[model samples]
Target: KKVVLSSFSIIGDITQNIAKDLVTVTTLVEAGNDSHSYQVTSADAIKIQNADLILCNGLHLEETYMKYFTNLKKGTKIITVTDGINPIGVSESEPNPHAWMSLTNAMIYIENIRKALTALDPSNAKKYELNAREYSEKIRNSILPLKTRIEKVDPEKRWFVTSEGCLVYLAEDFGFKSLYLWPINSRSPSMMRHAINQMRSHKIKFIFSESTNSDQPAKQVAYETNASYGGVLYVDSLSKPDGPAPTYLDLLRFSLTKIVDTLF
Candidate 1:
């Protein structure tokens, strides 16, 4: 049986749709877990060693520990889905890895996945290409309405005030400026102070949190600023099977709705 490994749950979902029965895909991180801060375990390392191929969003989206996988073994083909796309640089001077935010960029990702899978299994190349094309079309159709819906909001209200900086790609795609508390959760005192000062200066009306992070700081900001608070936007990971953001598409649509409802 063929095996494929993904850096985290969101990428795993995308890969599973294309690979389907042809390959067993393993995700290192679970749903609703933030990959940025995740620590790889011994079992995860073994899974990677046993996989036929690995797929990652790249651009340093995975936790620091996972970076070692890139150098683990020679000829252990690992592909970055965000390879050809132009990524935004984070405040910390690294490429923003959340390239899946824009539907057009996602098409490039699908194409990359197709190329990598086909190269790995020559006999199943056509099957992989067909599946990727079909899924790409679905992703395009699903996000078109979301683009329009987000555009309907006034430009002045287009600011994204989130607990984490994961919305960089989404905010850039939708022509909005994203304001965040810190680059990552392992926050420095200066960064936290800067975030609070920036929030006060911006006078942003809505504080956004992700499904993976604690919302207390966001709530506190909201209360202090007399702004409304939106909970857990579900960007980095999917929600549980019975939760509001059970699938990749559901997560995006739910986030879009909450953003528009709060800001519009």
Candidate 2:
């Protein structure tokens, strides 16, 4: 029988890329779900009890749901894919949980996933290794083209303004600066203040948000600053399976396309 693995959506997408047909993968957060503020249902807990392995981003990325998983089931192995990767610190927060933004760090995630799967299901060890290696190579090869496209954006216009703090690693990786309206995903009165300050300081022309969030803040920021507003950027979750950002690679590609069109 295949091993059962339960993961949050972001890690689920990455693990699915490697373990495609090898494991029975169930995600706690569905596509287009926000991991930071997701609430775990009884169904999610049941899945955890049945899972042979539980994969998570860790580093306190998942708000309430992650904490619930700790004692969900005895001997239900938990793996933190962000274990070895260094994460960027969110505003005044310890370390950001958005480690998967960097392809280099993603490779690390895949390696850890492969090891964990192999250890849990030794019969499929070779298959897991092969899948991990293939996926890692594809991710690495794809980065150069993304790098080139990102380089095309003028340095001054390369900065990103968003409603969430999820893009710090991506911004650092591609040599772009990231400014967020709110320190966290939750709405705050200071959001407008931060957005205004960023618009003036960075001269950011475009404002961005995620698919799962209200675009009101970004829109208001653009209107107030008299800056152009771009549409939502996918992070923390993939779009619907039939949508533009259906897969992990698709999400990255869609984001890059949006960035290039708006800022270049």
Candidate 3:
């Protein structure tokens, strides 16, 4: 059996849907965990050894396990889902690794996964294409209603202020003016002051904290600026089956739906 290892859950979700029963899909990271600082287990390394193809987000997002991944057994290829796509924002000062946050970029990621899976398992190539197509179409269909509903808000009310600057991809693509704490995890008091001042200046109505973070800093901003704290946005990881964002598609739709409901 072919072993395919996805570095984290969101990428795992895409790979499993594409590969189906063709490959043994294993996710390296668990739900609600931070991949930036993930510690790899020995058993996980063994899985990596068995993996014919390894998939990840790349661009320093998986820094904690970089050495481990680079040192994988011979003949194992580490394929990046964000390959051929350049990301933007604070982390992307060189290249932002969170390209999957944007719906348009997600399509590219899905296609990339499909291509890689097909290369490894050509007999099921047609199934891979059809699965990717169906998922992409589902995303496209889901986003239209999300986009249309948000039109009810005032143009200036379309704000995407968050504690973590991870939503750059979505805000850039969806036409929201976005801001966050310090980008990755840096929270300087001086920068906090600046962010609060900026929100005050804009009369920003929304204060968002990603699900992966504490939401306290964003809550602090809201308390100081009189803006409302919106619910958590799923950025770094998907939720468990019973949570808000169990799948990649659910994560995307949940975020957009939350935005529309909050802004409108």
Candidate 4:
């Protein structure tokens, strides 16, 4: 089988849709792990050297392990799936790297992965195209109805209060306004009052944290702001094989269920 390496589980799962059994899809950061802080391992180095294709989220989402890309064997293809995306801003200086959070952006990611796989293994190009089309349709069919439902809610009721600003792209597509305590990293942030006021002002009913992050910040916000702690949302990674979000499509379904099903 052809060998492909992905930067994280979410990207790995997306690649699996296109490659299926044609390629061995391996992830540097495992399922349910924190991609933001994942340090590269020697095993990852070995994998990269032998990879036929390498895919990454690549708008700084995997910043911690990016430098290792240079270690790949000569001519090993590396594709940054987030290329061509106009990223939402983290602030004046930095762009948010979580573009796959948006279904629209995810379609782009799927296409990019499809193209990369085709370019790497041209003999299987048609299979990759078929898989990409099928997976993309599956995502839109499942997730677009939730977007419609979310749009029908009051604008203020569409607020996303969370520990990290991972929902910027998701909010852009779903018509929600995001208010978070910190950018990407989960270390304690000093923006509690700001987040509290926004949640209070918007009368947001639910607050949340990513599965990879501590629930303490989200729970604390819920307590002080009197909103329901909406539990964990998957952002940077997927869960284990038997867990709630074992695939990219499952991740979207699980997260939308948490956000939309709980609210309405």
Best by TM-score: 4
Q: Write the per-residue lDDT of candidate 3 for residues 1-264, one digit (tens) a residue.
A: 788999899999988887777899998887777877678888888877788899988877887787877566677778888887766847436565668888788898899999998888888899999999998898889887787776667777777788877877777777777778877752678778988998899899888888878888888889999988997888888998999999998998998888888887
Better of 2 and 3 by TM-score: 3
Alpha-carbon runs more than 4 Å astray in model 1: 67-75, 188-203
- In candidate 2, which residue pairs get closer than 3 Å at backbone N, Cα or C atoms, i.e. clash? none
CA lDDT scores, all candidates in order: 0.77, 0.76, 0.82, 0.84
State TM-scores per candidate: 0.88, 0.90, 0.94, 0.94
Q: What tens digits encode model 2's per-residue C-alpha lDDT throughout 112-159?
A: 888888887888788888888998888777665877777888777878
In candidate 3, position 19 carries an lDDT of: 79
Poorest stretch of ten by lDDT in candidate 4 = 183-192
Candidate 4 residue lDDT tens string, 22-116: 99988888886676667778877888787888898877777777788776676787789988898788775577888888889989999999999
Greater-lDDT candidate between 3 and 4: 4
lDDT of 3 at 170: 79
| Winning candidate number (lDDT) | 4
RMSD to true structure for each model, in Å: 2.5, 2.1, 1.8, 1.6
Off by over 4 Å in 3: 71-73
Ordered by lDDT, highest first, the candidates read 4, 3, 1, 2
Q: What RMSD does model 2 have?
A: 2.1
* List of clashing residue pairs for candidate 1: none
